Amino acid sequence: ELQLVPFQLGHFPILQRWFATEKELVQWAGPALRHPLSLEQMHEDLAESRRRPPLRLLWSACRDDQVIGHCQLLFDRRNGVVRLARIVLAPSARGQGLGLPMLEALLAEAFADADIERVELNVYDWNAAARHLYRRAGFREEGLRRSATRVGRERWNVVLMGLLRQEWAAGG
Ligand SMILES: CC(C)(COP(=O)(O)OP(=O)(O)OC[C@H]1O[C@@H](n2cnc3c(N)ncnc32)[C@H](O)[C@@H]1OP(=O)(O)O)[C@@H](O)C(=O)NCCC(=O)NCCS
């Protein structure tokens, strides 16, 4: 069904189209982002993926040839922790139970290296869709970082969540 393949610039025009406004970019990728999404805005992230070993891995979720989502992994190899980030489905792919398959695939990649013992993520407290999806995928809420992210005149709270390898294995 859904496949995760390495992200490539060849997929950038598809990805760029999923964000209509600055706010949608910020929700996805944080307060540094500006609309339209541009390759220049992704340079630091992509360079992280060219380090050896790689600090970030970027992924495109595809169905056959069609790019329908994006996700990232950030590696803390000293501690054996990976952070999930920048998870999005194309707007036309939302509401079709593709959220969970994408998370399950991403988790598989995160735990592929046997030295990873923990996976984690941040989610804005108001991002109810994302938060429920993460819980369904087996993530436990671990805390709430108050007034952490500045966006305009607002400050957003960040829910922290985590999943241990033995929990991930127990669930599947
Ligand atoms: C987060 C995202 C990947 C989820 O996609 P999806 O799985 O199709 O999400 P949906 O819109 O179907 O909602 C998913 C689930 O949450 C539940 N849910 C709870 N509150 C919800 C809300 N406000 N809207 C939609 N679903 C909600 C749904 O019922 C569904 O679960 P169920 O089958 O158990 O009922 C998608 O919304 C997205 O790409 N959003 C924009 C980017 C973003 O916010 N990224 C996350 C942080 S980077």
From Swiss-Prot:
CoA binds at residues 27, 87-89, 95, 127, 132-134. Residues 2-166 form the N-acetyltransferase domain. It holds the Pfam family Acetyltransf_1. One of its GO terms (molecular function) is acyltransferase activity, transferring groups other than amino-acyl groups. Keywords: Acyltransferase, Transferase. Signal peptide: none annotated. Disulfide bonds: none annotated. It is an enzyme of class 2 (transferase). Its EC number is 2.3.1.-. Catalyzes the transfer of an acetyl group from acetyl coenzyme A (AcCoA) to an acceptor substrate and releases both CoA and the acetylated product. It prefers the antibiotic chloramphenicol. Homodimer. This is Acetyltransferase PA2578. It comes from Pseudomonas aeruginosa (strain ATCC 15692 / DSM 22644 / CIP 104116 / JCM 14847 / LMG 12228 / 1C / PRS 101 / PAO1).
